[PDB]
Curated annotation (Swiss-Prot):
Gene: LYZ
Any one biological process term the GO annotation gives: defense response to Gram-positive bacterium
CDD domains named among the record's database cross-references: LYZ_C
Family: Belongs to the glycosyl hydrolase 22 family.
Superkingdom per UniProt: Eukaryota
Annotated catalysed reactions: Hydrolysis of (1->4)-beta-linkages between N-acetylmuramic acid and N-acetyl-D-glucosamine residues in a peptidoglycan and between N-acetyl-D-glucosamine residues in chitodextrins
GO cellular component: cytoplasm; endoplasmic reticulum; extracellular space
EC number, UniProt record: 3.2.1.17
Paired cysteines (S-S): 6-127, 30-115, 64-80, 76-94
Name recorded for this polypeptide: Lysozyme C
Keyword Hydrolase: yes
Residues annotated to bind substrate: 101
Keyword Repeat appears in the UniProt entry: no
Domain C-type lysozyme: 1-129
Amino acid sequence: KVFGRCELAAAMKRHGLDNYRGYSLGNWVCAAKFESNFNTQATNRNTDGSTDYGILQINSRWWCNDGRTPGSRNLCNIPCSALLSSDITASVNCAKKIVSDGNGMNAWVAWRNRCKGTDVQAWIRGCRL
Ligand SMILES: [Cl-]
């Protein structure tokens, strides 16, 4: 599924991401835009044999099991295939674990480089929440 901006904002708000662990909703929408272009089926392979899955590009070395990543820890206790659903619940529930692990939203490279330090509230402007 490819979400619209406000559609994704509303879905993320319903699943409890607004202000979760200190991160306002616009952070999460900005991260999804630059990680996956709002596409629930995005995947990207990495040089360590891991793959990033879904709308928030969750990595198979640490967080989900894809059966093909050496050294996997599966800390979200979910198959990576669940993260390619058009329903974002499993991705959001795993993202909540990732942001609580330690280093906040710094797990998302595109957030760190392209969202942090900007006015991220602009990402939810004009949306009916
Ligand atoms: Cl899988």
